[PDB]
Amino acid sequence: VSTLIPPKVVSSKNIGSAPNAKRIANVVHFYKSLPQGPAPAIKANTRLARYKAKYFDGDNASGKPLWHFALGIIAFGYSMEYYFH
């Protein structure tokens, strides 16, 4: 006798699958993400975004700003030594 009609309705393998939850997530997350960004280091732009670019990028952990800032404090109280002299 005639083969039954349950297989001709699908709406329980289309909404009844687990990656649907991931699908609706990653259509929003990925589709709505700019493939590229603006600029990594730019804070303090006044030729001191350049200071950030040379020293406070994630492209270096080089000791130069530390040295520079340290030397600043040496310059601060030392000048004041000759101001207090």
Next chain:
Amino acid sequence: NVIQDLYLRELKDTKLAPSTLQDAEGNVKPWNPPQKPNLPELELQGPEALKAYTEQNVETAH
């Protein structure tokens, strides 16, 4: 000789034997015609069954 006597006697004196077709009938099966040339029964008419079936089995695909 004796061959002729018997031959003659038998042939001449008997040449009819009983033979009634009616008596035969008792000993054989009677012909009678087939019964029930019934046309097939029609069932599962309408999409009433189908709509019921689509709904009825919850698992339509899992």
